[PDB]
Amino acid sequence: SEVAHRFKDLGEENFKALVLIAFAQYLQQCPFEDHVKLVNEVTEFAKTCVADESAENCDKSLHTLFGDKLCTVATLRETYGEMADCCAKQEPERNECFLQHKDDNPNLPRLVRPEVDVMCTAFHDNEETFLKKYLYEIARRHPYFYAPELLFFAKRYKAAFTECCQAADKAACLLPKLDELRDEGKASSAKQRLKCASLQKFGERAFKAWAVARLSQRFPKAEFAEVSKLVTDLTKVHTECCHGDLLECADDRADLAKYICENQDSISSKLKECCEKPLLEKSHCIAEVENDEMPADLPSLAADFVESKDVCKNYAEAKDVFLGMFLYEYARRHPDYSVVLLLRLAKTYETTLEKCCAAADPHECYAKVFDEFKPLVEEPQNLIKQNCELFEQLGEYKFQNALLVRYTKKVPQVSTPTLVEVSRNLGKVGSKCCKHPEAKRMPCAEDYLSVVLNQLCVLHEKTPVSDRVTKCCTESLVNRRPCFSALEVDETYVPKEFNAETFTFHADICTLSEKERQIKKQTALVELVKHKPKATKEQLKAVMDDFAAFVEKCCKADDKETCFAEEGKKLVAASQAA
Ligand SMILES: CCCCC1C(=O)N(c2ccccc2)N(c2ccccc2)C1=O
């Protein structure tokens, strides 16, 4: 039995959780109650398998068990139409069908949070149904969310209430801690969506290369043979979590933490504090540990990679191991380089040996390879340096609006809601990275953009409208950012045409938070730039300055939300003028 295997390792608690997460990630539209029922019916079965390892279908693979269970409610097309098809399938891929149907943008209603007085009560009354709901809402809204880590967010989510409800001012103690978690959860989720996308669309060799470079950065003193071992396991873990095998992912992940702590001295000296605490915390600790100090006397790369005479020979024997070594050797002594820049140089190195080794004289051909690295390294540095100066000037908000206009001009087809989200996140890079020394600015900024741009790619892949986004997204993982910065403005885009609904103005906007108020303005700018791509300089501002006047006036005007209509039609006249 397999279901028995995972049960003994994870135990009732985590086992019940992980399966809830899995069920939620598959049927995101299914109600909380039904999931709970299935989870139990499923957990009860497991209990019998432990004793009798052959009872009913205890000999089954999780895929068959889980699949059939869900298919007892999926067949209801009136609720989950396209789903029933999945259930009529067989073993080889009745699952590939499900995975294929995960929604990265579920049409699930917003998740508002009741007063601090109810949450605490509901928390204290029933502590298990409260937390179960949490995971349910997060896993169903983040189908790729790193499960093992979602159990970590749960432990803190609980600790938040456990303490705050016992305060003098619960609303003061909770709120903050809850906001902080709302953000970190999103960050951790996107960061992970990039991992599942890599593996799934580019293959595991691409994921491995990324890992090798990142680990070689964190663990400089770690030997290549050791890192490889870590990369091999690591891949496997994530390969599983992404395919939907949460249980084994959660299991294997623990094993890896166990290992990394056992062989602490061979990997990094910054793992201490991490290995002296609870599993879940220990795991989330290692995965976020700072780079170890750089080894003292380190030879020069050129020695074994451009000057040696056996380069090509070695490359032919086992290129994959050779290029892997190069990356490792270049990453370890360069924690000031983003991971995508390292994978670029590496790719430039390979392409070079390829054409060079089939020449009349290699050493002469590949002798000036480093000469080509300069341009690649410079580029990010400049972009970052420039985009940080601007950010400082304008501040976050103003900087976001800059990126809004710019990107909408690049890819006007893209949906307003998506451009608004991406551009805002893109703006977050300033407050996040610009306050860092050049030595840590590149890794922070560029690698972050890789996550933000991946969001744009997956979202866009649902309904492809811009072939330009498509190419930059599919052509090369490592080059996505330079690919986008290259794009200027679409010269084939035909400006949209105005219509009342191009934007509705109902007063309901005077109640929304300050945030959703900015958002509404930005969503406007996007719609403006879509209508008038070309004619655009300062007239946009002049217009956006007017848009603000409109809201303030009719939100403050005692008269019903009407002046927003009269003066709203008045402002439209002025707007068109510019
Ligand atoms: C929220 C996503 C986390 C991804 C991640 C992971 O699961 N492991 C990880 C897995 C188990 C225990 C500790 C960390 N490490 C990791 C980092 C460097 C070297 C090896 C592993 C990670 O960065």
Coordinates of C-alpha atoms and ligand atoms in Angstrom, one line a residue:
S1 CA 0.0 0.0 0.0
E2 CA 1.1 3.5 -0.8
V3 CA -1.6 5.5 1.0
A4 CA -0.3 3.8 4.1
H5 CA 3.3 4.7 3.3
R6 CA 2.6 8.4 3.3
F7 CA 0.3 8.3 6.3
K8 CA 3.0 6.8 8.6
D9 CA 5.5 9.4 7.5
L10 CA 3.3 12.5 7.5
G11 CA 0.9 11.5 10.3
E12 CA -2.8 12.3 10.6
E13 CA -2.3 16.1 10.8
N14 CA -0.2 16.9 7.8
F15 CA -1.7 14.0 5.8
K16 CA -5.2 15.4 6.2
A17 CA -4.0 18.9 5.4
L18 CA -2.0 18.1 2.2
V19 CA -4.9 16.1 0.8
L20 CA -7.2 19.0 1.5
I21 CA -4.8 21.2 -0.4
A22 CA -4.6 18.8 -3.3
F23 CA -8.3 18.5 -3.6
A24 CA -8.7 22.2 -3.4
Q25 CA -6.1 22.8 -6.1
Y26 CA -7.9 20.4 -8.5
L27 CA -11.5 21.5 -7.9
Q28 CA -11.0 25.2 -7.1
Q29 CA -14.7 25.9 -7.7
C30 CA -15.9 23.1 -5.3
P31 CA -17.4 24.2 -2.0
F32 CA -15.5 23.8 1.3
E33 CA -18.1 21.3 2.8
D34 CA -17.8 18.8 0.0
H35 CA -14.0 18.9 0.1
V36 CA -14.1 18.2 3.8
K37 CA -16.4 15.2 3.2
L38 CA -14.2 13.7 0.5
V39 CA -11.0 14.4 2.6
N40 CA -12.5 12.4 5.5
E41 CA -13.9 9.5 3.4
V42 CA -10.4 9.4 2.0
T43 CA -8.7 9.7 5.4
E44 CA -10.9 6.9 6.9
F45 CA -10.0 4.6 4.1
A46 CA -6.3 5.2 4.7
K47 CA -6.7 4.3 8.4
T48 CA -7.8 0.8 7.4
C49 CA -4.9 0.4 4.9
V50 CA -2.5 0.9 7.8
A51 CA -3.8 -2.2 9.6
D52 CA -4.7 -4.3 6.5
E53 CA -2.3 -3.5 3.7
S54 CA -4.6 -5.1 1.1
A55 CA -8.2 -4.5 2.3
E56 CA -10.2 -2.8 -0.4
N57 CA -8.0 -1.0 -3.0
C58 CA -5.2 -0.2 -0.6
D59 CA -2.9 -1.6 -3.3
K60 CA -3.7 1.4 -5.4
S61 CA -1.7 4.4 -6.5
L62 CA -2.7 7.7 -5.1
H63 CA -3.7 8.8 -8.6
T64 CA -6.5 6.3 -8.9
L65 CA -7.9 6.7 -5.4
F66 CA -7.8 10.6 -5.5
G67 CA -9.1 10.7 -9.0
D68 CA -12.2 8.5 -8.4
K69 CA -13.0 10.4 -5.2
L70 CA -13.1 13.8 -7.0
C71 CA -15.0 12.2 -9.9
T72 CA -17.9 11.6 -7.6
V73 CA -18.7 15.3 -7.9
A74 CA -16.8 16.4 -11.0
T75 CA -19.3 14.5 -13.2
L76 CA -21.6 17.4 -12.4
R77 CA -20.9 19.4 -15.5
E78 CA -23.7 21.8 -14.6
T79 CA -21.2 23.0 -12.0
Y80 CA -17.9 21.8 -13.4
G81 CA -18.6 21.4 -17.1
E82 CA -15.2 20.7 -18.8
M83 CA -14.4 18.5 -15.8
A84 CA -16.6 15.4 -16.4
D85 CA -14.5 14.8 -19.6
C86 CA -11.5 14.3 -17.3
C87 CA -13.4 11.6 -15.4
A88 CA -14.3 9.6 -18.5
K89 CA -10.5 9.0 -19.0
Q90 CA -8.2 6.2 -17.9
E91 CA -5.1 5.8 -15.8
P92 CA -2.2 7.0 -18.0
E93 CA -3.6 10.5 -17.8
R94 CA -7.1 11.0 -16.2
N95 CA -4.8 13.2 -14.2
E96 CA -2.9 15.1 -16.9
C97 CA -6.4 16.2 -17.7
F98 CA -6.9 17.7 -14.3
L99 CA -3.5 19.4 -14.1
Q100 CA -4.3 20.8 -17.5
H101 CA -7.4 22.4 -16.1
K102 CA -6.0 24.3 -13.1
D103 CA -7.0 28.0 -13.3
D104 CA -4.3 30.6 -12.5
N105 CA -7.1 33.2 -12.3
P106 CA -10.2 31.6 -10.8
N107 CA -13.5 33.5 -11.1
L108 CA -13.7 33.2 -7.3
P109 CA -15.4 36.2 -5.5
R110 CA -13.1 38.4 -3.4
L111 CA -12.1 37.1 0.0
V112 CA -13.2 39.9 2.4
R113 CA -12.4 39.4 6.1
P114 CA -15.0 39.8 8.9
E115 CA -14.3 42.0 12.0
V116 CA -11.6 41.0 14.4
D117 CA -14.4 40.1 16.8
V118 CA -15.8 37.3 14.7
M119 CA -12.5 35.7 13.5
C120 CA -11.3 35.3 17.1
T121 CA -14.6 33.8 18.2
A122 CA -14.7 31.4 15.2
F123 CA -11.1 30.6 15.8
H124 CA -11.5 29.9 19.5
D125 CA -14.8 27.9 19.1
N126 CA -13.5 25.6 16.4
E127 CA -9.7 25.7 15.8
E128 CA -9.5 22.9 13.2
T129 CA -12.3 24.1 10.9
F130 CA -10.9 27.6 11.1
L131 CA -7.5 26.7 9.8
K132 CA -8.8 24.1 7.4
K133 CA -10.8 26.9 5.8
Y134 CA -7.7 29.0 5.5
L135 CA -5.7 26.5 3.5
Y136 CA -8.8 25.9 1.5
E137 CA -9.1 29.5 0.4
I138 CA -5.3 29.9 -0.3
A139 CA -4.8 26.5 -2.1
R140 CA -7.9 27.1 -4.3
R141 CA -6.7 30.5 -5.3
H142 CA -3.1 29.5 -5.8
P143 CA -3.1 26.1 -7.6
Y144 CA 0.7 25.9 -7.7
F145 CA 1.4 27.2 -4.2
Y146 CA 4.3 25.3 -2.7
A147 CA 2.3 22.9 -0.4
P148 CA 5.1 22.1 2.0
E149 CA 5.4 25.8 2.5
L150 CA 1.7 26.4 2.8
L151 CA 1.8 24.3 6.0
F152 CA 4.4 26.8 7.2
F153 CA 2.1 29.7 6.5
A154 CA -0.6 27.9 8.4
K155 CA 1.5 27.5 11.5
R156 CA 2.1 31.2 11.5
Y157 CA -1.5 32.1 10.5
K158 CA -2.6 30.2 13.7
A159 CA 0.1 31.8 15.9
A160 CA -1.2 35.1 14.7
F161 CA -4.7 34.5 16.3
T162 CA -3.3 32.4 19.2
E163 CA -1.6 35.6 20.4
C164 CA -3.6 38.5 19.1
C165 CA -7.0 37.4 20.4
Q166 CA -5.4 37.5 23.9
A167 CA -4.2 41.1 23.5
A168 CA -5.7 44.4 24.7
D169 CA -6.2 45.6 21.2
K170 CA -6.8 42.6 18.9
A171 CA -7.4 44.7 15.8
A172 CA -4.1 46.4 16.4
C173 CA -2.2 43.1 17.0
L174 CA -3.8 41.0 14.3
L175 CA -4.3 43.3 11.2
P176 CA -0.6 43.9 10.8
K177 CA 0.5 40.3 11.1
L178 CA -2.3 39.3 8.7
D179 CA -1.3 41.9 6.1
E180 CA 2.3 40.8 6.3
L181 CA 1.2 37.2 5.6
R182 CA -1.1 38.2 2.8
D183 CA 1.9 39.6 1.0
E184 CA 4.6 37.0 1.7
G185 CA 2.0 34.4 0.6
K186 CA 1.6 36.0 -2.8
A187 CA 5.4 36.5 -3.2
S188 CA 6.0 32.8 -2.3
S189 CA 3.3 31.7 -4.7
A190 CA 4.5 33.6 -7.7
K191 CA 8.1 32.7 -6.9
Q192 CA 6.9 29.1 -7.1
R193 CA 4.7 29.5 -10.2
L194 CA 8.0 30.3 -12.0
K195 CA 9.4 27.0 -10.8
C196 CA 6.5 24.9 -12.0
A197 CA 6.5 26.8 -15.3
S198 CA 10.2 26.1 -15.9
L199 CA 9.9 22.4 -15.3
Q200 CA 6.6 22.1 -17.3
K201 CA 7.4 24.3 -20.3
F202 CA 11.2 24.2 -20.6
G203 CA 12.1 20.8 -19.2
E204 CA 14.0 19.7 -16.1
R205 CA 17.4 20.5 -17.6
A206 CA 16.4 24.2 -17.4
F207 CA 15.3 23.8 -13.8
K208 CA 18.5 22.0 -12.9
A209 CA 20.7 24.8 -14.4
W210 CA 18.8 27.4 -12.5
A211 CA 19.2 25.4 -9.2
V212 CA 22.9 24.7 -9.8
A213 CA 23.6 28.4 -10.2
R214 CA 21.4 29.5 -7.2
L215 CA 22.9 26.9 -4.8
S216 CA 26.4 27.6 -6.0
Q217 CA 25.7 31.2 -5.0
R218 CA 24.4 30.3 -1.5
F219 CA 27.0 27.6 -0.9
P220 CA 30.3 28.8 -2.4
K221 CA 32.4 26.4 -0.3
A222 CA 30.3 23.4 -1.3
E223 CA 32.0 21.2 -3.8
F224 CA 30.4 20.6 -7.2
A225 CA 29.7 16.9 -6.5
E226 CA 27.7 17.9 -3.4
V227 CA 25.7 20.7 -5.1
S228 CA 24.7 18.3 -7.9
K229 CA 23.4 15.9 -5.3
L230 CA 21.3 18.8 -3.8
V231 CA 20.1 19.8 -7.3
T232 CA 19.1 16.3 -8.2
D233 CA 16.9 15.9 -5.1
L234 CA 15.6 19.4 -5.2
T235 CA 14.5 18.9 -8.8
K236 CA 12.6 15.8 -7.9
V237 CA 10.8 17.4 -5.0
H238 CA 9.5 20.3 -7.1
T239 CA 8.9 18.0 -10.0
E240 CA 6.4 16.3 -7.7
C241 CA 4.8 19.2 -6.1
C242 CA 4.1 20.7 -9.5
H243 CA 2.7 17.5 -11.0
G244 CA 0.3 17.3 -8.1
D245 CA 1.9 14.6 -6.0
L246 CA 1.8 16.7 -2.8
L247 CA 2.3 13.8 -0.3
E248 CA 5.6 12.5 -1.7
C249 CA 6.7 16.1 -2.3
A250 CA 6.1 16.9 1.4
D251 CA 7.9 13.7 2.3
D252 CA 11.0 14.0 0.1
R253 CA 11.2 17.7 1.1
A254 CA 11.7 16.7 4.7
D255 CA 14.3 14.1 3.8
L256 CA 16.3 16.8 2.0
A257 CA 16.1 19.2 5.0
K258 CA 17.3 16.2 7.2
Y259 CA 20.2 15.6 4.8
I260 CA 21.3 19.3 4.5
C261 CA 21.4 19.5 8.3
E262 CA 23.2 16.2 8.8
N263 CA 26.0 17.3 6.4
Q264 CA 26.0 21.0 7.5
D265 CA 29.8 21.3 7.6
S266 CA 30.1 20.2 4.0
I267 CA 27.6 22.7 2.6
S268 CA 27.3 26.0 4.5
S269 CA 28.2 27.5 7.9
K270 CA 25.0 29.6 7.9
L271 CA 22.8 26.6 8.4
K272 CA 23.3 26.3 12.1
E273 CA 20.4 28.4 13.3
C274 CA 18.2 26.6 10.8
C275 CA 18.9 23.1 12.0
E276 CA 18.1 23.9 15.7
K277 CA 14.3 24.3 15.2
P278 CA 11.0 22.6 14.2
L279 CA 10.9 20.8 10.8
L280 CA 8.5 23.2 9.0
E281 CA 10.4 26.2 10.3
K282 CA 13.8 24.4 9.6
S283 CA 12.7 23.9 5.9
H284 CA 11.5 27.5 5.3
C285 CA 14.8 28.6 7.0
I286 CA 17.2 26.7 4.8
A287 CA 15.3 27.7 1.7
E288 CA 15.9 31.4 2.6
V289 CA 19.4 31.3 4.0
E290 CA 22.0 34.0 3.1
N291 CA 25.0 33.1 1.0
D292 CA 28.0 31.7 2.8
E293 CA 31.3 33.6 2.8
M294 CA 33.4 33.2 -0.4
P295 CA 36.3 30.8 -0.3
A296 CA 39.7 32.6 0.1
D297 CA 42.2 31.7 -2.5
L298 CA 40.2 30.8 -5.6
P299 CA 41.9 30.3 -9.0
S300 CA 40.9 32.2 -12.1
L301 CA 38.1 30.8 -14.3
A302 CA 40.1 31.4 -17.6
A303 CA 42.6 28.8 -16.4
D304 CA 40.3 25.7 -16.8
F305 CA 37.7 27.2 -19.2
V306 CA 39.4 29.3 -21.8
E307 CA 43.2 28.8 -21.5
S308 CA 43.5 25.1 -21.0
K309 CA 44.0 23.1 -24.3
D310 CA 41.6 20.3 -23.3
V311 CA 38.5 22.5 -23.2
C312 CA 36.8 21.1 -26.3
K313 CA 37.9 17.6 -25.4
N314 CA 36.4 17.7 -22.0
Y315 CA 33.3 19.4 -23.5
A316 CA 32.8 16.4 -25.8
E317 CA 33.2 13.8 -23.1
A318 CA 30.4 15.1 -20.9
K319 CA 29.3 18.6 -21.9
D320 CA 26.4 18.5 -19.4
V321 CA 28.8 17.9 -16.6
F322 CA 31.3 20.4 -18.0
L323 CA 28.9 23.2 -18.6
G324 CA 27.4 22.4 -15.2
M325 CA 30.8 22.9 -13.7
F326 CA 31.4 26.2 -15.5
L327 CA 28.1 27.6 -14.2
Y328 CA 29.0 26.4 -10.7
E329 CA 32.5 27.9 -10.9
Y330 CA 31.1 31.2 -12.3
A331 CA 28.3 31.4 -9.8
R332 CA 30.2 30.7 -6.6
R333 CA 32.5 33.7 -7.1
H334 CA 29.7 35.9 -8.3
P335 CA 26.9 36.5 -5.7
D336 CA 26.6 40.0 -7.2
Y337 CA 25.1 38.5 -10.4
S338 CA 21.4 37.7 -10.9
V339 CA 20.7 34.0 -11.5
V340 CA 19.4 34.7 -15.0
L341 CA 22.6 36.6 -15.9
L342 CA 24.6 33.6 -14.9
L343 CA 22.5 31.4 -17.0
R344 CA 23.0 33.8 -19.9
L345 CA 26.8 33.8 -19.7
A346 CA 26.6 30.0 -19.4
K347 CA 24.5 29.8 -22.5
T348 CA 26.9 32.2 -24.3
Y349 CA 29.8 29.9 -23.3
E350 CA 28.1 26.8 -24.6
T351 CA 27.0 28.3 -28.0
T352 CA 30.7 29.4 -28.2
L353 CA 32.3 26.0 -27.7
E354 CA 29.8 24.5 -30.1
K355 CA 30.9 26.6 -33.1
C356 CA 34.4 26.9 -31.8
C357 CA 35.3 23.3 -31.3
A358 CA 34.4 22.3 -34.8
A359 CA 37.0 24.8 -36.1
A360 CA 40.5 24.4 -37.6
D361 CA 41.9 25.7 -34.3
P362 CA 39.8 26.0 -31.2
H363 CA 42.0 27.8 -28.7
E364 CA 42.2 30.6 -31.1
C365 CA 38.4 30.7 -31.6
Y366 CA 37.2 30.5 -28.0
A367 CA 40.2 32.4 -26.7
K368 CA 38.3 35.7 -26.4
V369 CA 35.0 34.4 -25.0
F370 CA 35.1 36.6 -21.9
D371 CA 35.1 39.6 -24.3
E372 CA 31.5 38.8 -25.1
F373 CA 30.4 38.5 -21.4
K374 CA 31.0 42.2 -20.8
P375 CA 28.0 43.4 -22.8
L376 CA 25.7 41.0 -21.0
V377 CA 26.9 42.0 -17.5
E378 CA 26.8 45.7 -18.3
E379 CA 23.3 45.7 -19.6
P380 CA 21.5 44.8 -16.3
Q381 CA 23.7 47.1 -14.3
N382 CA 22.8 50.1 -16.4
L383 CA 19.1 49.3 -16.6
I384 CA 18.9 48.8 -12.9
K385 CA 21.0 52.0 -12.2
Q386 CA 18.7 54.1 -14.5
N387 CA 15.4 52.6 -13.3
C388 CA 16.4 53.2 -9.7
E389 CA 17.3 56.8 -10.2
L390 CA 13.8 57.4 -11.8
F391 CA 12.1 55.4 -9.0
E392 CA 13.7 57.7 -6.4
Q393 CA 12.6 60.8 -8.2
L394 CA 8.9 59.9 -8.8
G395 CA 8.5 57.6 -5.8
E396 CA 6.7 54.2 -6.1
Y397 CA 3.3 55.3 -7.4
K398 CA 4.6 57.7 -10.0
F399 CA 7.2 55.1 -11.0
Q400 CA 4.4 52.6 -11.5
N401 CA 2.5 54.9 -13.8
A402 CA 5.6 55.4 -15.8
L403 CA 5.9 51.6 -16.3
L404 CA 2.2 51.4 -17.1
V405 CA 2.3 53.8 -20.0
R406 CA 5.5 52.2 -21.3
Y407 CA 4.3 48.6 -21.2
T408 CA 0.8 49.3 -22.5
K409 CA 2.6 50.8 -25.5
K410 CA 4.7 47.7 -25.9
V411 CA 1.8 45.2 -25.8
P412 CA -1.5 47.1 -26.2
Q413 CA -3.5 43.9 -26.9
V414 CA -2.9 42.5 -23.4
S415 CA -5.9 42.9 -21.0
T416 CA -6.0 46.0 -18.9
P417 CA -6.5 44.1 -15.7
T418 CA -3.3 42.1 -16.4
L419 CA -1.2 45.2 -17.4
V420 CA -2.3 47.0 -14.2
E421 CA -1.3 44.1 -12.0
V422 CA 2.1 43.4 -13.7
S423 CA 3.1 47.0 -13.9
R424 CA 2.4 47.5 -10.2
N425 CA 4.4 44.5 -9.2
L426 CA 7.1 45.7 -11.6
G427 CA 7.1 49.0 -9.7
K428 CA 7.5 47.2 -6.4
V429 CA 11.1 46.4 -7.5
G430 CA 12.2 49.9 -6.7
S431 CA 11.2 49.9 -3.0
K432 CA 12.4 46.3 -2.8
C433 CA 15.8 46.5 -4.6
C434 CA 16.9 50.1 -5.1
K435 CA 17.7 50.5 -1.4
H436 CA 20.5 48.0 -1.8
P437 CA 24.2 48.3 -2.5
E438 CA 25.2 47.7 -6.2
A439 CA 26.6 44.3 -4.9
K440 CA 23.2 43.0 -4.1
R441 CA 21.1 45.2 -6.5
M442 CA 21.3 43.1 -9.6
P443 CA 20.4 39.7 -8.0
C444 CA 17.6 41.3 -6.2
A445 CA 16.1 43.3 -9.1
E446 CA 16.6 41.1 -12.3
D447 CA 15.7 37.8 -10.7
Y448 CA 12.6 39.4 -9.2
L449 CA 11.5 40.7 -12.7
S450 CA 11.8 37.1 -13.8
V451 CA 9.0 36.2 -11.5
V452 CA 6.9 39.2 -12.3
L453 CA 7.3 38.6 -16.0
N454 CA 6.4 35.0 -15.6
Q455 CA 3.1 36.1 -14.1
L456 CA 2.4 38.0 -17.3
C457 CA 3.3 35.0 -19.4
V458 CA 1.1 32.4 -17.7
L459 CA -1.8 34.8 -17.4
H460 CA -1.4 35.6 -21.1
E461 CA -1.1 32.0 -22.1
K462 CA -4.7 31.5 -21.1
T463 CA -6.0 33.8 -23.8
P464 CA -3.1 34.8 -26.2
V465 CA -3.8 38.1 -27.9
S466 CA -0.3 39.4 -28.4
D467 CA 2.2 37.3 -30.5
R468 CA 5.0 39.6 -29.2
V469 CA 4.3 38.6 -25.6
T470 CA 4.1 35.0 -26.8
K471 CA 7.5 35.0 -28.5
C472 CA 9.3 36.7 -25.6
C473 CA 7.6 34.3 -23.3
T474 CA 8.4 31.1 -25.3
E475 CA 11.6 31.8 -27.1
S476 CA 13.9 31.8 -24.0
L477 CA 13.3 31.6 -20.2
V478 CA 16.6 33.2 -19.3
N479 CA 16.2 36.0 -21.9
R480 CA 12.6 37.0 -21.2
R481 CA 13.6 40.3 -19.5
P482 CA 16.1 41.5 -22.1
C483 CA 13.5 40.4 -24.6
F484 CA 10.8 42.7 -23.2
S485 CA 13.1 45.7 -22.6
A486 CA 13.9 45.4 -26.3
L487 CA 10.2 45.9 -27.3
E488 CA 9.5 49.6 -27.8
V489 CA 5.9 50.3 -29.0
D490 CA 3.7 48.3 -31.3
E491 CA 3.5 50.0 -34.7
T492 CA 0.8 47.6 -35.8
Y493 CA -1.7 48.3 -33.0
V494 CA -4.9 50.0 -34.1
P495 CA -6.1 52.4 -31.3
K496 CA -9.3 51.2 -29.5
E497 CA -12.4 53.2 -29.9
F498 CA -14.2 55.1 -27.1
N499 CA -17.6 53.9 -25.8
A500 CA -19.3 54.6 -22.5
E501 CA -18.5 51.2 -21.0
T502 CA -14.8 51.8 -21.9
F503 CA -15.0 52.8 -18.3
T504 CA -18.0 52.9 -15.9
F505 CA -18.1 55.7 -13.3
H506 CA -20.8 54.7 -10.7
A507 CA -20.0 56.5 -7.4
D508 CA -19.4 53.1 -5.6
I509 CA -15.8 54.2 -5.8
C510 CA -15.9 56.7 -2.9
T511 CA -16.1 53.8 -0.4
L512 CA -13.1 51.7 -1.6
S513 CA -9.8 51.8 0.2
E514 CA -7.0 54.2 -0.8
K515 CA -5.3 51.3 -2.6
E516 CA -8.3 50.3 -4.8
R517 CA -8.6 54.0 -5.5
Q518 CA -5.1 54.2 -7.0
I519 CA -5.8 51.0 -8.9
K520 CA -8.9 52.5 -10.4
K521 CA -6.8 55.5 -11.6
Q522 CA -4.1 53.2 -13.1
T523 CA -6.7 51.1 -14.8
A524 CA -7.8 54.4 -16.4
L525 CA -4.3 55.4 -17.6
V526 CA -4.0 52.0 -19.3
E527 CA -7.3 52.5 -21.1
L528 CA -6.2 56.0 -22.1
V529 CA -2.9 54.8 -23.5
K530 CA -4.7 52.1 -25.4
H531 CA -6.9 54.7 -27.1
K532 CA -4.1 57.2 -27.8
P533 CA -0.8 55.3 -27.9
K534 CA 1.1 57.9 -30.1
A535 CA -0.2 61.4 -29.0
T536 CA 1.3 61.0 -25.5
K537 CA 3.8 63.0 -23.5
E538 CA 2.4 65.2 -20.8
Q539 CA -1.2 65.3 -22.0
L540 CA -1.6 62.0 -20.2
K541 CA -0.7 63.7 -16.9
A542 CA -2.8 66.7 -17.7
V543 CA -5.7 64.3 -18.2
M544 CA -4.9 62.1 -15.2
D545 CA -4.7 65.3 -13.1
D546 CA -8.2 66.0 -14.3
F547 CA -9.5 62.5 -13.5
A548 CA -8.5 63.1 -9.9
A549 CA -10.4 66.4 -9.7
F550 CA -13.5 64.5 -10.9
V551 CA -13.4 61.9 -8.1
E552 CA -12.6 64.3 -5.3
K553 CA -15.4 66.7 -6.4
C554 CA -18.3 64.3 -6.9
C555 CA -17.3 62.1 -3.9
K556 CA -17.3 65.2 -1.8
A557 CA -20.3 66.8 -3.5
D558 CA -23.3 66.1 -1.3
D559 CA -25.5 65.8 -4.3
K560 CA -26.1 62.2 -5.2
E561 CA -23.4 60.4 -7.3
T562 CA -24.8 62.5 -10.1
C563 CA -22.1 65.2 -10.6
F564 CA -19.9 62.3 -11.5
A565 CA -22.2 62.0 -14.5
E566 CA -22.7 65.7 -15.3
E567 CA -19.2 66.8 -14.5
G568 CA -18.2 63.3 -15.7
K569 CA -19.5 64.1 -19.1
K570 CA -17.9 67.5 -18.8
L571 CA -14.5 66.1 -18.1
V572 CA -14.8 63.7 -21.0
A573 CA -15.1 66.7 -23.3
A574 CA -11.9 68.2 -21.9
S575 CA -10.0 64.9 -22.0
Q576 CA -10.7 64.4 -25.7
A577 CA -9.4 67.9 -26.3
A578 CA -5.9 66.7 -25.2
Ligands
LIG1 C1 9.0 28.5 -1.2 C2 9.8 27.7 -2.3 C3 10.9 27.0 -1.7 C4 11.9 26.3 -2.7 C5 13.0 25.6 -2.0 C6 12.9 24.3 -1.4 O1 11.9 23.5 -1.4 N1 14.2 23.9 -0.8 C7 14.3 23.2 0.5 C8 13.7 21.9 0.7 C9 13.8 21.2 1.9 C10 14.5 21.8 3.0 C11 15.0 23.1 2.9 C12 14.9 23.8 1.6 N2 15.1 25.1 -1.0 C13 16.5 24.8 -1.2 C14 17.4 25.9 -1.3 C15 18.8 25.8 -1.5 C16 19.4 24.5 -1.5 C17 18.6 23.4 -1.4 C18 17.2 23.5 -1.2 C19 14.3 26.1 -1.8 O2 14.8 27.2 -2.2

